[PDB]
């Protein structure tokens, strides 16, 4: 995957953590079509943000996403139990491109 | 004498019937679409005529004079033998070849001039 | 001090939208051809369209947010629908077609025998016709067929009194509205236009219906223009306009003969008679040299648009319907498609005869994807021949090797290739100005 | 907006697999239609997008020459066909509908909010 | 220079071409209903313009002085810096925000004062 | 003398009124607003003082204009949909219900219908209602098969009453009688002008003004003349009455093919228990609303008299019951329980039987019928009642008791309930005056 995402993340419910989608100058730095899908256990990934920092209706405010130059980022706020899902960063690198996805855990082992 | 009533009247008296045709000019589904088309055509023609009266140095009805010269090309003849020898019908038939240029001249040579020096003299 | 003074009749324009009427040429007034499709009630054109050139002036043009093309598209849709309403409806053509082949030895020509209601509703007749394979679909004893759009629309025969030739048409803004012409040589669609001029009526573009290329167009630019809101967007259709017209010779050798078939009281449908002579197929001939040189010009500009010099492969249409995959157009009254794969197969890295394209004829058509209203194009007697000169290409970039493929389908791009340089602006003759003048009490 | 997908299919490598994905709850010919393939346990992958108006398609460089995707406006069914199957083709396939209509500024490359249930294909050398 | 000819010309020169476009402000089934709708729109817009021009207290054409003070703030320039520096296009662009209040104020404060004391001074 | 231009003059006059609707969901050209211009974003409502206008809501010509406009709009939106002329066919129809009176009112009719191909014919079945078919001498047939041409409302369009504002053109102003105690005829102390009216829901109903305007904080009994029994008595409430209208039957829609390009949507099997629609109204709130309305009625007939409420006298089904639409189909609630009280001097909900009727010939235009398509799933809607179209029964020699019965039928009364406080007046800004001025020579 051209969108270099870290392997996995772990934490606990309640606090706020961040995940970054670090890309080159042609996928995230060159274009503002960034996005952040959320794949569900054996289900279709549903984006949580749809642009550099745009989110449609049907998602809580705890997902703050933005691009820090060539390193797009997503922030998980007020972690809870249902947050047990992997999140895919999406960008248009002269075409669709999907990130590696990051495992996330709350109140549990890494 | 009604709409187009004093058409055959000489200009000595025809100058006093102008208000009649001025007043009646705009005359205060299929088979009904013609009514709409005819009324909008009447409105458009009336406003075209009023615009011509407006872009000219008249801004009024039945009368206006101006400072632009008259041309011999336009039926060169003396006052008496154009105001008492013919009516507007024959005269128009003999001058309906210069109408565009006569309008253009009496428009630009004064509206583009006399209003400009009017503004200039009010500018002092 | 200072004082305000308003001027009436000021040369001020603003971007705006209004319904633009037409003014077609009067040379067709002796060639009505029974109310030809494009022009029925269009007023005569202006004998001397005054294209006032303007200096010390620049206007921000935009050919993609342009609403002139939207008005063109909706107007063509409405005109085509209106010209199709009074003609013969073909609801009795939906019938079990007992259909066979025509090729005696080693489809595209189906001899279909079927039943039809005659003039007398009580009586019924047995008639046959030659439909194309693309026109019928098999339903599952010989193989019974039925019309392709019999279960999804209502087939209407374009009454043959009208003709489909694209007439030189004009869009003229109403009174108090000006049409700005971006007359400058180097223009791409967006940005300031140095040479802008006003005109009452449009340049004049025939309402051509086409897919892969742009027949009967006009480009004064000496080089191909690559016009797209985002060349970086691969999906974005990279509209192309050939600087040099490419002469094409599409010929339909089949000697098709129109065969009137009564479909009821005061109802008759023109079927297809026996194809006189050898059973052949329509074919488009493009001079290989002309096509290669024009491809060189376009690839040069494409390389200039995409980097400086990159590997560019002209490939066949990636996908689409018959109209999209195979270039569609009207030659002499009937619509047929050619795969145009000999035109898009050149893989170019850095640097006499004619290419012949297989063409397939599809009489029944529902163009513009107006589902529920499909037209049956009647057969045209005799051999059909028409010669055009391509002026444009509807290319789309694929996702160091940038491969281009033809696209289209959407008909707004057909008009945009010609309404690119025009825009409509309204007049606001009222304007405030400061002046030392002062009226009297 | 709801998208039914076809049932599970079992295929042998070298064969051709075709899947269906209906459309309901919106205008059919005004939204691009992405096709997404997810291998079990691997990253997310894209197949192509259909423009239902005129049936315009655009594939992926890794999948050019194998995939062929079409649609029919009558029944409003999205057909995705994949031929020349390989071992790695064993996956679950998803059909994604865009947020905005096809006339948006970046319509074909938007978020593709609506996702079908998903169809899983098993391409195994075993019988 | 014809309809909208001297658009890019200096306002001092643009004052001499007002009438060539004031003259052309009228220009004299489906696919034909567009002609009717367009002509109705044109005639109504021209009458709106004439209503504005007449209600402002001049009823004249191409020149209209008044008795309402033009505060320096709106101009923020001088006679030469307005009539020579820029043409009407960018002038309108830089002023196309106050035209509503400009029109309303120069119409009300002119008419309902000057006309009223004009009737008063003729009432004596 | 002296003429003034712009003199505050209005005179009673009639003119064509265009519309204005909210920009808030096209739903394929909703019946109410398709080409209606956007409403005024900020409805400047201008109040007036020292103003007295002779209002007359019964001689008002606005209501006739809106009635004819609604007729034309319904015909226009109904014209392009599917014709149902092939439904005239012998219906082999049988009862559905095993147990006695478990539900008539549900007829399973199997009949013939021509398919896409005219050669073949298909045998199909549907669940009609008793009110929709009649027996021919068991064999049934559609009730409106011998008097009109059935036309299915194409289900792409909805029947939603959207708020509509009728806005007078230039030179015409709409007067609003803003005073509280408004009788219907006579001077209005508080007359205020506005560009145009509030959001009018053009609901179709009889005997109950569903989703009407209830701004009248008093129950003002209106009629063109109280003493005339034969003229309907208009009543407008102050407190809304909630109603729970449901169609508990879960119908599935079967798209029986009447192609080419034509679809006849017939009801499939009712998946679930067979039930009949019931229109519930809270007994309490309805009681107190009747108490208020009778207290106000006693002001028009004596000081203390017996007021009796009874079920509709007789007539067509659309008059003896409560016609309206809930979520896409027309049905009627006999409301025989809402009018049964007799009042001399001074928690649950009443339930009303409600009968579905798909085929409808509303407005009694014999030239065209209509077939409301089935709506999938359970239909539930809640409306608010703001008025009663009551009619007074004839009196006697000694009328110590006066009985009020529901009426309606003529839809003009439905429209008058929303346009009582509006009227159009044309402006005459020309007017002479005496002055001491003198024009010069
Ligand atoms: C007086 O005013 C009432 C309030 O507006 C109105 O009652 C509501 O009317 C609306 C519109 O008819 C009802 O909602 C729609 O109902 C239809 C039929 O069920 C639906 O097709 C439609 O969309 C669907 O809604 C489903 C969920 O209900 C959803 O799953 C589908 O995907 C789809 O979006 C609307 O739901 C509404 O239920 C009525 N009641 C309520 C509780 O608001 C009265 O009819 C009106 N009276 C008159 C005479 O006009
Ligand atoms: C009106 O008539 C037209 C013309 O007859 C008709 O169009 C056809 O509809 C059928 C469906 O009824 C379409 O059939 C499909 O076509 C695709 C083409 O790629 C096939 O892949 C489909 O079958 C395969 O795939 C399925 C899963 O996706 C499998 O379940 C199946 O076993 C197969 O492997 C299927 O055949 C057909 O393409 C169109 N068009 C044509 C040209 O036939 C239209 O549906 C009719 N409308 C109505 C409402 O009746
Ligand atoms: C692009 O432009 C070129 C140049 O204008 C077009 O080529 C010409 O098209 C003409 C129209 O198709 C064609 O003439 C005749 O073509 C048909 C007959 O072959 C038919 O459309 C008309 O003739 C009919 O004749 C019958 C028998 O008399 C009548 O009953 C009918 O009413 C018609 O009159 C056309 O006159 C012409 O030959 C052809 N070439 C030349 C040299 O002009 C080209 O089609 C355009 N392409 C597109 C896509 O529009
Ligand atoms: C109205 O009458 C309809 C016709 O009798 C009835 O539907 C039909 O009911 C029969 C059973 O009585 C079904 O018969 C078939 O059922 C299954 C189908 O897979 C199999 O056992 C056999 O194929 C069998 O023949 C019909 O399929 C069914 N529909 C049709 C098209 O005939 C309706 O249910 C009746 N409606 C009501 C509410 O009474
Ligand atoms: C299509 O089939 C018809 C019917 O066979 C052909 O027309 C008939 O041809 C026979 C001779 O083979 C004649 O005797 C008949 O008079 C013809 N017409 C009728 C009404 O039967 C027709 O030629 C075939 N078309 C092609 C091109 O094969
Ligand atoms: C565009 O390319 C396609 C192939 O992608 C051409 O159609 C055929 O496709 C099948 C596979 O589905 C191949 O086996 C054939 O060899 C292809 N024929 C060719 C290459 O001509 C299609 O004809 C090409 N041109 C168009 C769309 O007009
Ligand atoms: C099509 O084929 C016919 C038959 O060979 C050619 O001849 C004409 O056919 C029509 C119809 O039978 C006759 O009315 C004419 O008199 C025939 N002309 C001649 C000279 O014999 C016809 O010319 C062919 N058309 C084309 C354009 O090739
Ligand atoms: C549709 O039309 C056919 C025409 O034949 C009807 O068929 C007959 O039906 C009766 C019973 O109603 C049988 O006694 C006959 O034997 C049938 N004739 C044939 C040739 O099948 C059919 O009944 C009609 N459809 C319905 C629902 O009644
Ligand atoms: C008003 O009430 C009367 C009964 O008092 C209703 O008449 C009866 O209605 C039932 C049901 O339709 C019939 O079975 C009876 O035979 C009727 N009786 C008579 C004497 O006709 C009447 O229908 C009610 N009216 C309304 C509009 O509800
Ligand atoms: C009307 O009945 C149908 C058929 O029962 C309902 O649709 C679905 O039916 C299946 C099979 O019984 C159930 O598993 C589904 O759960 C049903 N849908 C839903 C959303 O529950 C349909 O829902 C019924 N409609 C109503 C409004 O009750
Ligand atoms: C509304 O009026 C109808 C009569 O038009 C009432 O119908 C009842 O119908 C049943 C048979 O279905 C009879 O046994 C009853 O005698 C009828 N009652 C009357 C009053 O006639 C219906 O019940 C009434 N609804 C109410 C009272 O809410
Ligand atoms: C247009 O015609 C060309 C030439 O006949 C087609 O190209 C061939 O397509 C077949 C499959 O249909 C392949 O097997 C051949 O290898 C292709 N090339 C040659 C040289 O024959 C082309 O496919 C046609 N257009 C479409 C859309 O099928
Ligand atoms: C007829 O013409 C003569 C010409 O001198 C004129 O005096 C007279 O008034 C005219 N009569 C009418 C009624 O036009
Ligand atoms: C008037 O104009 C004509 C041309 O229209 C010209 O020949 C003539 O010399 C001009 N002047 C006079 C005095 O006629
Ligand atoms: C135009 O010129 C001819 C020259 O003979 C003359 O007879 C005519 O009256 C002139 N004016 C017109 C045509 O009205
Ligand atoms: C002839 O008809 C058959 C179907 O009956 C069809 O398969 C075939 O392609 C047709 N044409 C030829 C050349 O056989
Ligand atoms: C035209 O070129 C300019 C740069 O000179 C660019 O900003 C603009 O987007 C281009 N327009 C199009 C339609 O490509
Ligand atoms: C297009 O060019 C390539 C060049 O290798 C050739 O192989 C191919 O056959 C050409 N196209 C056709 C349709 O012959
Ligand atoms: C075009 O012509 C050049 C020579 O001028 C040749 O090298 C090139 O291969 C040709 N391209 C095609 C597609 O024939
Ligand atoms: C293209 O063909 C048309 C056919 O009418 C012709 O008028 C035009 O001059 C041709 N193109 C050029 C540039 O010659
Ligand atoms: C453009 O500006 C130059 C400035 O020197 C001036 O000389 C020229 O006349 C202007 N042209 C127009 C058409 O106003
Ligand atoms: C001038 O003064 C008036 C009155 O205060 C104000 O309404 C108007 O906006 C001012 N405009 C300028 C700065 O010319
Ligand atoms: C109009 O004036 C306002 C207030 O100064 C300003 O914000 C706006 O940008 C101006 N618009 C122009 C100059 O077009
Ligand atoms: C069957 O239908 C007839 C139609 O008149 C109806 O009278 C009868 O009550 C229904 N049910 C039974 C059990 O006969
Ligand atoms: C007018 O109001 C009075 C009460 O003030 C009422 O008696 C009378 O009937 C009303 N007239 C009409 C017809 O509204
Ligand atoms: C009807 O149903 C609605 C929704 O449940 C409820 O709010 C309302 O109170 C009900 N009607 C009555 C009269 O209670
Ligand atoms: C209405 O009141 C009468 C009074 O006699 C009673 O017989 C009847 O049952 C009542 N109806 C309802 C539905 O309560
Ligand atoms: C009018 O009906 C609506 C539901 O359609 C309800 O919400 C409202 O409360 C009712 N009346 C008022 C103004 O309270």
Residue numbers in the entry:
A (entry chain K): 2 to 9, 11 to 27, 27A, 27B, 27C, 28 to 94, 96 to 110
B (entry chain D), E (entry chain E): 520 to 547, 569 to 664
C (entry chain B): 33 to 138, 152 to 185, 187 to 309, 312 to 321, 321A, 322 to 398, 411 to 458, 464 to 505
D (entry chain H): 2 to 52, 52A, 53 to 82, 82A, 82B, 82C, 83 to 100, 100A, ...
F (entry chain C): 36 to 59, 63 to 141, 152 to 185, 189 to 309, 312 to 321, 321A, 322 to 398, 411 to 505
Sentences from the paper on this structure:
Impacts on neutralization for each variant were evaluated, and this information was used to design minimally mutated IOMA-class variants (IOMAmin) that incorporated the fewest SHMs required for achieving IOMA’s neutralization breadth.
Class I (3.9 Å resolution) revealed density for three IOMAmin5 and three 10-1074 Fabs bound to BG505, while class II (4.2 Å) displayed density for only two IOMAmin5 and three 10-1074 Fabs bound to BG505. A comparison of the paratopes of IOMAmin5 and IOMA revealed that residues engaged with the gp120 CD4bs were largely similar. The most notable differences were observed in the CDRH2s, where IOMAmin5 exhibited interactions not seen in IOMA, utilizing F52HC, attributed to SHM, along with I75HC, which was one of the SHM reversions incorporated into the IOMAmin5 design.
